[PDB]
Each structure stands twice: as structure tokens, then as C-alpha cells.
Amino acid sequence: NPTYFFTFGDSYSQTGFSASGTQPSASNPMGNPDLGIGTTTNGPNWIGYLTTTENASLVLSYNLAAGGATIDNALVPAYPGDLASQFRLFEDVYADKPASAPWSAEDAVFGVWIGDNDIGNAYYSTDAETYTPKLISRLESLVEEVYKNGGRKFLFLNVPPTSRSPLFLEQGEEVVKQHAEYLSVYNENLEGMVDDFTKKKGDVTTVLYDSWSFMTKILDDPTAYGFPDATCINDDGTSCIWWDNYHPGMKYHLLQAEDMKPKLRKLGGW
């Protein structure tokens, strides 16, 4: 009895899954591409680990995340595959519960990790207090589309401290600070939305995962986690926290997935 895990997000979540590629099955839970391909980590990412390593029962992964995505190109634009377009792909192929993904309220989990690229492209040009609610409201409206389809179990990840990626550190401490302060307001508004949605609906099971505090703990004490420092880059994905100047490697993603497992038990697959 599988859990259907539909995910939405950006390069921290992409695996290159195609809706016309091989579809998830018990023998092939990611569908496509092979587990460990298509990511920004040198191997599996958090979704691959949650699906195949941390799972307590069969999890089938339909991963619609796309590189560089923002929430909606009508707000902060970037690439064609914004979160809105990912939700449209879901509506076009999976929302109506086809034989290849015959999901129900009791066995579908919708995971969303989004907002980093919106912050990264708006943190110096917009007022966080009045602009981040517009981003969060659009996210909520997209979540409502899945609710109307019958989705009831939701996983939201807050934005991690990308302010401390090598890419941002190179821009100076005051830019790190400006970006971090904006990011904090987004994450507060995300938590508020998730709380309000949960209470207003009354029939949903939700998890807000604080990726920000977890990664911050590792960046603040990297050697406790087997990393030599908090800034080095290594594309092996394991020798350093960072796989390139902006994206963490498979070791970080595994540590995060292991941290998430206990917090995901109420969602059915862990």
C-alpha cells in the first residue's frame, strides 16, 4: 500500500523526473531517472533519501521540482518552470488520480520546498514585511488547488540559510545580513500560513520542517557532522557541505532526510 509523494520545488529538490518517463513502481520508486541522477548533490537528494532510504513503507516519488524555480513568474520571475507551472503539470497529469497514480486523501503526501529564489531575487528591491505576504498568498492558492483535488497531507520546508552559501558569502557580510533578514520574514510568514491553513481546513495533516535551524546547526559546528569547515566546496558531495557554490551535497541531504524522518511519521511513509 504505497504513499504517493508529489514534490514541488527548485534546484535543492530537482531530480529531472519527466511525466512521460518511466513512472514510479514498487520496483522503481523514483520512476525516472535512476536514483542518484539529476540532482545538485552528486547522488541522491533529500527526496531520494526520503523515498528509498528513510521510508518505513513503500513510497512512490513524483518529483515535479525544477531548477531555479520561483513561486510565480507574475511576482518574482526566473525560469519557465515556476511553482505555478509545476502545479499545472500536476493538474494536467496526476490530479485526476489516473491508473498510474491512483492516489487518495489517505495516501498522498504533497511536499513543497520553495521561496529561496524569490528571496534571492527580491531581497534588496522589495519590502519583506509587505512583499513576502504576496508570495506566501500565491503559494497558499496553489496548495488550495491540490486541496480541491482531494489532497489532505502536506509537507512544507522553510528556506535554509542560503545567505551562508559560498556564493553569498563572497558578496560581503552586509549582503549576507540583508539577505538573511529578508529570508527570516519569509519563513515567519510561511509558518503563519501553514498554521492558518491547518486550522481553517480542520481535516489536513501538515508538517512544517525547519530546514533553516538544521542547516544552521551544521554550518555553526561543521566538524560535529564530519565536515572540515562550513565553506569548502567539493563536487564529490561528501567531503564538504557544498557540492558547488550554492547547493549542498548528498551527505548534507542525507543528514537532513534522517533529521526529517521522525517528524514525517504522521504523514504515513516514514
| Half-sphere exposure of residue 58: CA atoms within 13 angstroms, side-chain side | 11
Q: Which has the closest alpha carbon to 68: 18, 135, 105, 121?
A: 121
Of the candidate CATH numbers 3.40.50.170, 3.40.50.150, 3.30.470.20, 3.40.50.1110, the domain formed by 3-267 belongs to: 3.40.50.1110
What is the edge-to-edge ordering of all strands in the sheet holding 108-113? Answer: 59-63, 3-9, 108-113, 153-157, 205-209
- The answer, yes or no, to whether the previous bond of 33 is cis (omega within 30 of 0) is yes
| Method used to determine the 3D structure | X-ray
Name 109's Cβ contacts closer than 8 Å, sequence gap at least 6.
3, 4, 5, 6, 153, 154, 155, 267, 268, 269
How far is the first Cα of the chain from the last one, in angstroms, to the nearest whole number?
A: 13
Q: What SS3 class is residue 88?
A: helix
d(CA 183, CA 115): 9
d(CA 208, CA 157): 6
Amino acid at 93: V
Cα dihedral 72, 62, 189, 68 sign: negative
Residue 246 neighbours by CB distance under 10 Å: 17
Q: Residue for cell digits 519569509? A: 186
Name 198's Cβ contacts closer than 8 Å, sequence gap at least 6.
204, 206
Name 47's Cβ contacts closer than 8 Å, sequence gap at least 6.
5, 7, 13, 15, 61, 63, 65, 111
Structural domain spans, the chain: 3-267
Q: Which has the closest alpha carbon to 117: 147, 148, 78?
A: 78
| Half-sphere exposure of residue 198: CA atoms within 13 angstroms, side-chain side | 14
d(CA 268, CA 265): 6
**Dihedral (Cα; 12, 3, 210, 213), 10-degree rounding:** -70
- Resolution in Å, one decimal place: 1.5
Q: Which has the closest alpha carbon to 252: 268, 270, 236, 269?
A: 236
Q: Which has the closest alpha carbon to 84: 121, 139, 14, 146?
A: 139
What is residue 38's DSSP assignment?
S
The rounded Cα 250 to chain-centroid distance in angstroms is 15
Query: What distances in angstroms separate CA 14 from CA 44, 103, 161, 227, one per listed residue?
Result: 10, 22, 19, 24
d(CA 257, CA 252): 9
Q: Which has the closest alpha carbon to 245: 158, 173, 175, 170?
A: 170
Amino acid at 4: Y
